Design a protein. Structure first.
Lengths: 63, 13, 223, 214, 54
């Protein structure tokens, strides 16, 4: 079925953005990690913490 | 998210 | 100024036919490609067809091939989309655009779009009711009032206030489909409380598909 | 055909922030990708063409990039007027195809709604139906709970909500809730109440009227 | 505008279809005029519609 993964994007300077990915849990997951990796190129190494069975993520960038 | 004629915008959730 | 203006969109029964036009100005369609692109809840932005008026070459989306034809009259600087054997899935805003204009390889001008509604339901004009300002619609020295535009079909309607002179503080809500299969929306505006009774407030409602034009004066109700 | 996959589907960020949205082609499309913006009530408007080139008149805070079959659109300093949907499109092969879009919203401070209520008009009551309207004006965030009560009985299944897109001047929302009853039902009850729950309110707010009161 | 024998044949087939109404019949004829390159496709879709309205 279709789910929404909600993501907090937490940047090194304390700024916070939020995003959503939709699809099967597997598709949305992959997309969220893909997006994190992309932002990491500019915003520094990321770490992703999963809550709510993986359906919510807190993604912090090192700067 | 789903496009709506009335607003010409995607509506999410 | 480059401009494209679509016309001809309207209610049509399933299996029916409609013809759209795309009037270009400010450039010559002989110099570009012309496209039809549609947009719908079901499929989002979907390319329909294109033509190169200089040599007449055309291409079509698989889902419309045989049912739709694109053409162009360069002497009128106008392109067309004939739409036959129409289905619910064809319900969409239809835009025309140009591509290759001034050497830009993208769709750089799009028209305002024309809505095509494929449905067996019949046209119905709206009832327009006031949302009168009252002791229950005011706070902080400002007051809300509005118009309820209820029970119409098909889209679109337009709503303005004081013939477009009043725009600040206006909220016109997205149309909702009622269980009846008819649309409804409200438009409200917030104004100074002190202006009630001295400033006239009128909502201008137009429902072209039913030829319904209403200008409804909204006032505090007499007690 | 070529598929264009856009991520994320929704992104919310503060004014002045740098935001990045992405678009992936299912196969090579060279640089033949354009980005369009669609604002409320508007048509698609060209921002970027051939992956990285700014269309005339587009603010320089927009930029685009390509890496293989991955495309990015960046806004370097998000502005209130950038609140819109963004679409990518490949023109490498026929049919040209579009991504499903990314909605970009503006983050701002919490604001509680102004809550108002409108009885049915006497005009409408001449016919057989009554519409009661509850109005929530200029609030943020979008989440809000509106419940109807008629003579203190919670109503279910007989109201519809509608919410505007973010305001261009203050990035807030407004919402209408419309309760629909027969005239006969309306004339049978006395107290009409809409209760609003919203993060900006310290506790729920009830706006009501008695039918017949001026 | 003039037509070759294939084009004329397509017009004739659509003109004669018994289960089209006149709005549909003329819509398809208009399509044949609009885009000759689509004659075969247009004829096929006219046939399908005619058959479904039998
Ligand atoms: O004016 C187009 C649209 O906003 C209205 O028809 C209500 O949906």
């Amino acid at each position: 079925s279709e789910v929404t993964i909600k993501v907090n994007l937490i940047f090194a300077d304390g700024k916070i953005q939020t995003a959503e990915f939709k699809g099967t849990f597997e598709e949305a997951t992959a997309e969220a990690y893909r997006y994190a990796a992309l932002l990491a190129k500019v915003n520094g190494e990321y770490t992703a913490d999963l809550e709510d069975g993986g359906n919510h993520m807190n993604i912090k960038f090192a700067g | 998210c789903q496009f709506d004629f009335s607003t010409r915008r995607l509506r999410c959730g | 100024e480059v401009q494209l203006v679509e016309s001809g969109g309207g209610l049509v029964q399933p299996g029916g036919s409609l013809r759209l036009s795309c009037a270009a100005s400010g450039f010559n369609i002989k110099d570009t490609y012309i496209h039809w692109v549609r947009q719908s809840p079901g499929k989002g932005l979907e390319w329909v067809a294109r033509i190169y008026p200089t040599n007449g070459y055309t291409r079509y989306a698989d889902s419309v091939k045989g049912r739709f034809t694109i053409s162009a009259d360069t002497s009128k600087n106008t392109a067309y989309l004939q739409m036959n054997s129409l289905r619910a899935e064809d319900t969409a805003i239809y835009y025309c655009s140009r591509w290759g204009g001034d050497g830009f390889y993208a769709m750089d001008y799009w028209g305002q779009g024309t809505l095509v509604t494929v449905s067996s339901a019949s046209t119905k004009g709206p009832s327009v009711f006031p949302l009168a300002p009252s002791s229950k619609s005011t706070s902080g020295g400002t007051a809300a009032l509005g118009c309820l535009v209820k029970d119409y079909f098909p889209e679109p309607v337009t709503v303005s206030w004081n013939s477009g002179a009043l725009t600040s503080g206006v909220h016109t809500f997205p149309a909702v489909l009622q269980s009846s299969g008819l649309y409804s929306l409200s438009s409200v505006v917030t104004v100074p409380s002190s202006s009630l009774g001295t400033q006239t407030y009128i909502c201008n409602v137009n429902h072209k598909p039913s030829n319904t034009k209403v200008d409804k004066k909204v006032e505090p109700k007499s007690c | 055909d070529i598929q264009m996959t856009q991520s994320p589907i929704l992104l919310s960020a503060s004014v002045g922030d740098r935001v990045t949205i992405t678009c992936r082609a299912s196969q090579d499309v060279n640089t033949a990708v354009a980005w369009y913006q669609q604002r409320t009530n508007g048509s698609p408007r060209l921002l970027i063409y051939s992956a990285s080139f700014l269309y005339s008149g587009v603010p320089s805070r927009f930029s685009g990039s390509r890496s293989g079959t991955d495309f990015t659109l960046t806004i370097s300093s998000l502005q209130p007027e950038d609140e819109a949907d963004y679409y990518c499109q490949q023109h490498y092969t026929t049919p040209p195809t579009f991504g499903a879009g990314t909605k970009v919203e503006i983050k701002r401070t919490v604001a509680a709604p102004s809550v108002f209520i409108f009885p049915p008009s006497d005009e409408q009551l001449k016919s057989g139906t009554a519409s009661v309207v509850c109005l929530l004006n200029n609030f943020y965030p979008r989440e809000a709970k509106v419940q109807w009560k008629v003579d203190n009985a919670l109503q279910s299944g007989n109201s519809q909500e509608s919410v505007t897109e973010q305001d261009s001047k203050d990035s807030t929302y407004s919402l209408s809730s419309t309760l629909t009853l027969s005239k006969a039902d309306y004339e049978k009850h006395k107290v009409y109440a809409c209760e609003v729950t919203h993060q900006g309110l310290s506790s729920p707010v009830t706006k009501s009227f008695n039918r017949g009161e001026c | 505008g003039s037509y070759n024998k294939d084009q004329q044949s397509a017009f004739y087939e659509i003109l004669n279809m018994p289960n089209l109404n006149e709005a549909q019949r003329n819509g398809f004829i208009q399509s044949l005029k609009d885009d000759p390159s689509q004659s075969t496709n247009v004829l096929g879709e006219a046939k399908k519609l005619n058959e479904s309205q039998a």
